[PDB]
Amino acid sequence: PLESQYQVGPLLGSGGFGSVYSGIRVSDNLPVAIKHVEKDRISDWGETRVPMEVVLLKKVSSGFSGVIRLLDWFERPDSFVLILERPEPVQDLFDFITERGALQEELARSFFWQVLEAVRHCHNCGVLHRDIKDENILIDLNRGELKLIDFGSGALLKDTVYTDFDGTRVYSPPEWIRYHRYHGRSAAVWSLGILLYDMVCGDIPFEHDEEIIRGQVFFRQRVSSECQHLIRWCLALRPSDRPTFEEIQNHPWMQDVLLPQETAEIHLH
Ligand SMILES: O=c1cc(N2CCOCC2)oc2c(-c3ccccc3)cccc12
């Protein structure tokens, strides 16, 4: 009985990924997110079959982390309903950046660092997000913690090649656009490259396929030499030339990161 446990709220937003509503678990007023997904629209199914999101989230969730947790899910004749956690107050990185524009490097460092830990956790649990970007990143405004959301385009992590991709094009790597082929970890680093640039410049670097395959990065804002360096490194044209998660976090620009709470007190409150 879904209609009895949760009290549906306003529509938060929708897309090809389905519709998401705000809500509260009657059981204890816990704020949640209710995601609806029509079966006719699912492209990848996992194991009883279910939408990828459910399989992936079940592999990571367990335990504390920077990934939105799957509280529960229900199957209906023509769709699935996912109960995701919902932090309040909250705002996604997209709206946050659109509001304040370019983020200060100290804040960008704290945020970027949390995303790195989040992604490392996913990969560590055999899950590959495949659509990392500002929209899929939520900010818990009080604790200054970031959450990774929407694993609708994700997949199980593997070391062999990937020939399918249903993520955000402007965030996709040169190898995908030129050969419809890419490897998990490396394509992930590239999108992280776009993300960092988005954070420190207030916008994504490439808009057209030409720009992506050319891989020339131009800065419209003042960014430190080191940050500019880490960004161009993640955006290397040759996948094997990109850094490992370990190399990124060991990067000079990634040192002396702030704690989530500190980040909140200084930049969010
Ligand atoms: O998978 C998810 C998809 C979404 N949606 C996708 C459509 O646009 C609006 C955000 O939102 C989620 C949220 C959430 C986002 C913003 C505000 C409040 C809750 C919390 C947990 C999981 C999800």
Alpha-carbon gap, residue 126 to 123, rounded angstroms = 5
Which residue minimizes the CA distance to atom 9 of ligand 1? Answer: 13
Pair 140, 90: CB distance under 8 Å: yes
Alpha-carbon gap, residue 269 to 266, rounded angstroms = 7
Each domain of the chain, given as residue ranges in start order, spans: 1-88, 89-269
Residue carrying the six token digits 């970007």:
133
Q: What is the CATH number of domain 1-88?
A: 3.30.200.20
Q: How was this structure determined?
A: X-ray
Q: Has 131 been annotated as catalytic?
A: yes
Q: Do domains 1-88 and 89-269 have the same CATH topology?
A: no
Alpha-carbon gap, residue 264 to 254, rounded angstroms = 18
Q: How far is the CA of 12 from the centre of ligand 1 (A)?
A: 7
Give domain 89-269's CATH architecture. Orthogonal Bundle (1.10)
Pair 103, 111: CB distance under 8 Å: yes
Q: How far is the CA of 164 from the centre of ligand 1 (A)?
A: 24
Out of 40, 78, 95, 131, pick the active-site residue.
131
Q: Exposed/middle/buried for 226, CB within 10 Å: 0-12, 13-18, 19+? A: middle
State the DSSP H helix or E strand holding residue 189, giving kind and residue range, or none if neither: helix 184-201
Resolution of the structure, angstroms:
2.5
